[PDB]
Structure 1
Amino acid sequence: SPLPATHDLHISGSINGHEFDLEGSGKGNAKEGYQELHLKSNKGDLSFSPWILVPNIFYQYLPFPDGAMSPYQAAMHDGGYVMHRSMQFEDGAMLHSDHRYIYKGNHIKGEFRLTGSGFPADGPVMTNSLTAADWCVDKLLYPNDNTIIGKFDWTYTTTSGKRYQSDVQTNVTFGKPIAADILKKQPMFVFRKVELKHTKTELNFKQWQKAFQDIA
């Protein structure tokens, strides 16, 4: 049926052993790749940079080239999917997440669970020193008919001027096979840009996305 138009998210888990829990709703344009989302904390002030919740804070808004359904869009009413992502940061920290969804017509409800640990007390996550995430190219491959293995190098700029880097791998597992015509076009890349306004208790996130097999 339809592409999604609106979504909500409950995201919870712990960073360095401290529990956090946020929820909120947003919307987007699934032909353009754009979405935005507001979150508010249920457990008081975040003790860590809200920027570490990106990329984790909805590829059902991502089309494939020339208006084709991405595998995420096609699965939405046919079998669904989950994601499992790993971020391994340069200073020894790690952050994993599980991503699950429920659809009600053109509305997506996400339930994401995250565990992040090992962030140094004086590093840029626990001092709120991340300032922006660099624009990013995601590389996707499909090693079998129901799995995407994707990877990107993820870097934030920070207040000291040094970037903060992590290796990010995302495995996406589908309830039914991906269409043969999607499977034959590998690798697929996706260019993304994000913005985030935030306080200690609230986030306003925006993201643009565009898949490509080749450039102009």
Structure 2
Amino acid sequence: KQYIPDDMELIFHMDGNVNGHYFTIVATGKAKPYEGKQNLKATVTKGAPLPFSTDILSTVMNRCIVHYPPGIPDYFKQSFPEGYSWERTFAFEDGGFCTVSADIKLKDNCFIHTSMFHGTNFPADGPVMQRKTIQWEKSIEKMTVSDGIVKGDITMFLLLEGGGKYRCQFHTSYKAKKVVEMPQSHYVEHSIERTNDDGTQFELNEHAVARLNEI
């Protein structure tokens, strides 16, 4: 009956382009969905070494990795076994705009993640094209039901080389392939850390938990 276990495996294939630089990445990883914790190692197979900040991709490489308390409906764990997809728009403060889509399927113990990524209008000596991002700041995303599906808005900042912050607005729409119990408006706190990039291979780690307002 439980299609998602305490320990999951992760596979990822990403194809995309940024400013007309095409690339392709594969990665494998391990996760504990009920703890909201996961990690990855990615390997760039085309376009490497990446000429842009890995950070614009990192949040693209699954809301099932979020500790959901009882009394918040878990949209993501309930979408299985059929799975769910999501689309996301990234509007960066310097005009850079990224559209991304993703399919997530379930095969026994392994999440299979299908990511397409298009970024455009990133300035030549911006922090993205010159790869001067350090990390995303920890975040809290707001999840609301809209057109019968879950939506997820978050204002996000990248810390830059030498300090200072580079703002981005996320709009993610989550589409379950199936009729699930709909959640209320709630939040999901996030924290991603990017270890060990070298252009070609990188490590990701993320902790996320869903919570409510303190009414």
Tell me the TM-score range normalised by the shorter chain. Answer: over 0.9
Q: C-alpha displacement at 1:144, in angstroms?
A: 4.1
Q: C-alpha displacement at 1:112, in angstroms?
A: 0.3
Within 5 Å, which residues of 2 pair with 1:144-163?
A: 144-145=147-148, 147-163=149-165
1:46 counterpart residue number: 50
Q: C-alpha displacement at 1:164, in angstroms?
A: 0.6
Within 5 Å, which residues of 2 pair with 1:127-206?
A: 127-145=130-148, 147-179=149-181, 182-183=182-183, 185=184, 187-197=185-195, 198-206=197-205
Q: C-alpha displacement at 1:160, in angstroms?
A: 3.7
Q: Which amino acid aligns with 1:111?
A: T
Q: 2:112 aligns with which of 90, 100, 109?
A: 109
The answer to whether the 8 Å contact 1:56/1:97 transfers is yes
2:213 counterpart residue number: 214
Q: Which amino acid aligns with 1:171?
A: S
Give the secondary structure class of the aligned counterpart of 2:70.
helix
1:66 counterpart residue number: 70
Query: 2: distance between equivalents of 1:111 and 1:82?
Result: 9
Is 1:36 matched up with 2:35? no
The answer to whether the 8 Å contact 2:83/2:106 transfers is no
Moved more, 88-97 or 1-10: 1-10
The answer to whether the 8 Å contact 1:3/1:61 transfers is no
Runs (4+) off by over 3 Å: 66-69
Query: 1: distance between equivalents of 2:33 and 2:61?
Result: 16
The answer to whether the 8 Å contact 1:63/1:69 transfers is no
Deviation per CA, 1:21-66: give whole Å up to 9, x if none: 0001001111110000110010221111111112111112223213
Q: 1:56 aligns with which of 46, 56, 60?
A: 60
What RMSD in Å do the two structures reach over aligned CA positions?
Answer: 1.7
Query: 2: distance between equivalents of 1:189 and 1:68?
Result: 10
Q: 2:93 aligns with which of 80, 90, 94?
A: 90
Q: C-alpha displacement at 1:101, in angstroms?
A: 2.0
Deviation per CA, 1:53-111: give whole Å up to 9, x if none: 1211111222321397621111121x321100000011111001010022111211111
Query: Unaligned regions of 5+ residues in structure 1, if any?
Result: none
Matched residues, number: 210
Deviation per CA, 1:104-147: give whole Å up to 9, x if none: 112111110000011101100111100111010000001243x1
Query: 2: distance between equivalents of 1:24 and 1:215?
Result: 38
